[PDB]
Amino acid sequence: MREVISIHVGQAGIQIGNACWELFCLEHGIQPDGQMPDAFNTFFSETGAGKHVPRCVFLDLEPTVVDEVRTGTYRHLFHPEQLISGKEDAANNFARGHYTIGKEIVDLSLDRIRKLADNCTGLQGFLMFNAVGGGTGSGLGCLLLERLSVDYGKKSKLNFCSWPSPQVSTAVVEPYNSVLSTHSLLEHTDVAVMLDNEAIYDICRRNLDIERPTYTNLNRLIAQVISSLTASLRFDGALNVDVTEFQTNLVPYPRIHFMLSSYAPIISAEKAYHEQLSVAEITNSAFEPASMMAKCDPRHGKYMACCLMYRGDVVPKDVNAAVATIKTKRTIQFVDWCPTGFKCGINYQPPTVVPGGDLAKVMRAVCMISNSTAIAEVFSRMDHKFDLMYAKRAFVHWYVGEGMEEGEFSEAREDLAALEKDYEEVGI
Amino acid sequence: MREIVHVQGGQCGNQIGAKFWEVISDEHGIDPTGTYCGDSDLQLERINVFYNEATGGRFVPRAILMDLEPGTMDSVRAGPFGQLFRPDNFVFGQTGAGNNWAKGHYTEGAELIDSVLDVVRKEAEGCDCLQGFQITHSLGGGTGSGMGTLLISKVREEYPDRIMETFSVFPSPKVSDTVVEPYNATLSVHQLVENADEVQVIDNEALYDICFRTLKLTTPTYGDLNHLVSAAMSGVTCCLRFPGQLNSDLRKLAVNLIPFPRLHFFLIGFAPLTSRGSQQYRALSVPELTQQMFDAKNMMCASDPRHGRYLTASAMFRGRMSTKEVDEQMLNVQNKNSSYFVEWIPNNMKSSVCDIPPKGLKMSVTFVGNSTAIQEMFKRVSDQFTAMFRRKAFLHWYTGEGMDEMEFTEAESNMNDLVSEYQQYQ
Amino acid sequence: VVKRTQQGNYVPVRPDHFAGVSVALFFAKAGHSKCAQIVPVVRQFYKTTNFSGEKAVIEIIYVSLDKDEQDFERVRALMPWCSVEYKSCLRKKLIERYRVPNSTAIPLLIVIGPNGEEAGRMNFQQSDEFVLQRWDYRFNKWP
C-alpha cells in the first residue's frame, strides 16, 4: 500500500545492500528467517501468515557476489527468484553493461519489479544502489532505470550512487565510466545522493579510531544513513517527511539534483563516555566540513537547500534553537536568492545499533542531505581526467569495438560542460 | 562454471607444466594419486577451474600434453604427480620436429592436429561455456615454437570470443642455445601478435640472476627456476579460484592492461624473494613488497626497465592486506618513480587483493607490467634475424618444407612494425 | 552403548539429548576418499544449523564399519557429534537391520524417526551436493 521498491545493481550496490538489509531487519525485529517471534510494510511484503520478504531485487552479471548471499545466513530471507546472477562479468565496460550482455538480463529483472509493484497502488518510488566507475554498476544501472522511467514515469527515484574518489580510482575506466553514466542518469533520476569511498576512510581514521577499515565497515555507515532517511516512512514522530517530499524541497531547477550527505555522531565506544550528545553539538558536527561523506569541500561551496532529518529523543524547542545558531554562523554560507534553506524533520525512534558493530549507543542522531554548489569541483576534476585520457584516444577501441558509436563521448562531454556551468551560473 | 584448458607444448613446456601442476595441486591439496585431503570447503569450492570429478572422487587435470618427441612427456608420466594426467590426453609423436619451425607448422605437424584438435574440443564442449586457455611453450625451439603455434591459430578461429594467455621463454643475450633462435623467434612472433591475446615473456639469464643474487643458492637445477615460474602462473590466476576485496579475472586484467590490440607482451615479478639468512631481518608488510616490485634485479625478464617508461602495470596482491596502505602506497610508487612511468596515462599502476595467501608465506604479490623496455629486446632479435638472412644462412631446411622467400621478408617487416609501435609511444 | 565425546574423556550421553530433535545415523568408513570428502561438509552443516539459534536441532550418531580400534578412534576423535561404541551389539544390529552391504554404499545418511526405523534414506555417491540442505529436520523430530 505504502512501500518503496529497492534495486541493487553492481557489486557496490550488492554488498551495501546486504549491509542495509541486515540493519533493516534488525530494527524491525525480524529474524534472518523473516518472521517476528504496520511498521514493517514500507520495506517488506507479508508472506502467508507472519513472515516477510524484502521488497528488493539483486541484479549482477558475475555470480560471485550474489551467490554468496544465496549461501550465507541470509538464505531464506530473500525470495529466490530475484537473486539474479548472470554468467560472465561486465568487466569495467559501459558499452558491455548497456548493449550486449545487459539485454538478456533486464527482461527478467523488469518482470520481477513489475510483479512486485502490481501488488498495491500508492507506490512511493525507487531506491537505486549502484557504483559509477564500475562496469555493471553503471551500464546495467542505466538500462534498468531507463525502462522504469518509461513505464512508471511519475514516481520518485533515489540513486544512492558511490562516486569515484578524487585521488584513488583503481581503474583506467573511472573517467570513461563516470562521464557516460551521468549523461545517461542525469535526465532519468530524481535525487542522486553523492557518496565517496576515501571520504569515509578518514572518517573511520579520525573519529571511529580504526587504523584498518575494510569494505564492510564502509557499508555499515552507508546503512545508517539510509535507515535515517526512511525513518519517517517507517515510524511516527513529532514532524515527519516523505521520499515524495524530498525533491519538492531539494530540486529547485530540473537538472540540479546532485546532493551530498552527512551523519552525526560517529563516535567510538571509548570516547562516547566523555560526551553527552546534545542537540546543540551534534548539529554542529554535522555541518563541519570534515564530517561529511564526500569531502567535496563546502568552504568554497555556497549552500542552496538542506534537509535535516533529526532522529531519536529530540524536542522541537531546541532543534529550532540549534538551526538558529547555524544561520548566523559565518562559515556555513547560504545563497542570496534562496532565503529559507532549512527543512527539518523529527522522528521518535532512536538509531539502531547492530551487535558487535563499530558505532556506539547514542541517544540522538542527525542525518543531512544538502544541495550545494560545491559539486562543481567534483565534476570539474572528472571533466579534466577525461580530457587528458581522450587527448589521443586511449582505450576507445574497447568501447567502439563493443558496439557503442564513437562520438557518444563528445555528447557526454558537452552535457557535463553544461552541468558544470549551471552550478557556477546559479551561485553568482 | 568457468574452465581453463591447459595445453603444454615443446620440451620446455612439458617440463615447466610438470611443476605448474605441482603447485596447483599443492594450492588446493590434491594427493598425487588424485584423492583430496585438506578438509576445507573454500579450497575447492572453485575446483572445476582446472580439474574434473571422476565418480571415484579423483580429480584429473584438464591438461593436454602435446609434442612430437615421444620421450620428453614419457618423462612426465613416470615422474611425481604424473599419474594425475589422463592417458588419453597424451598425443604422442614419432619423428620429432628437429628444431625446424617449418616442419612443426606446415609439413610434419599437420597430420597430428587431426588428433589434438579432437581431444581439445571434446573437453571444451563437455562443460557449460569455456573461459580461457593456457599454453606453456618456448619460442626458441622447434616443436613448441612452431607446432605449438599451429594449435594457437586453429583454436582462435574456432573460439574467437574466448581468451588465451601463454608463458613463453625467449632467446637470452649472452648464453644462447639452439643456433636457429631468430628464425624460430621471429616466425613465431608474427603469428603470436595475430592470434594470441596475452603473452608473458621469460628470459633464461634473468632467472639465473634471481637464484644467484636473491635466493643465495649456488647449484640448483631447472627445478628451482620452474618453481619460480610456477608460482608466477599460480599468482596471476589466484583470483578465479578464491574470493577477495578487489577481485580479478584474466579478461579483466586483459582490458585493464593493453591500450592497443597489437602490443600485449608482459613482464613478470614476484615477492618475497629473500634467502634463508635474510628472512629474520625482514618483517613482511605492504611497503617493502612494493619496493621489491620496482627492483630491476627482481624482474623476470632481463630487459632493463630503467631505460624505458612503464606504459601500464598490474599487481595482484595475495593475503590479508589493509586496503588503504595498499592503494595509497600504490599511488605513492607512481609519484616516487615519476619518470619511470608514462605521462599520458593518469594512474599508471593498479592493484587487486586475492584473499588467500600461498601456504608457507603470509603476503605475496605478482607483478605484470606492460613496459616499453621490450623495445631493445625485440630489436636484439631483429638484428639477429638480419644477420642470418642477408644471404640465406640455414635457409634450406625451412625452404625444403614449403617455405617461401617472401614469407621470411613478411616476418621481418611484421615483427619490425611491433618494434616501431612501442618506440612511437614515448 | 552410545558415547558423547567431551573435554578430557568420553561420557555416556544424556537420555534427554535425543528428545525433541532429528537424529541421523551416519554410516561411514575410515580413510575412505568419499568418507574424507563428506566429513567436513557435514561438519560445517551441523555447526551452522545448531549454532544458528538457541536449542540444538539435529544430532548425528556416527556408526563405523572399520575393522580396527586405531582406525575407529582416529576417525572418531575429530568429530563434534556423538558416536556408537565399537564393542556394543547395537552397531552390528543397525548394520544387519539396515542392510549396508559393507563400495558405493558409503557414506550413508539414514534419518530416523522415534520408532528407530527408516524415516528417510539418503546416499552421497552421486553428482549432487545440495542433499545436505535437502535433509530437513522440521518434518521428522521426536517426542
Binding site: - | G38, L42, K359 | -
Partner: peptide
Amino acid sequence: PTLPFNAQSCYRSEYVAKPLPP
C-alpha cells in the same frame, strides 16, 4: 602433512543471526 587453510570469509564470519530487539 600439506599446510593448512586458515581464512574464513568476512560475510560468514560477521553476519551472524542476531538476537532480536524486543
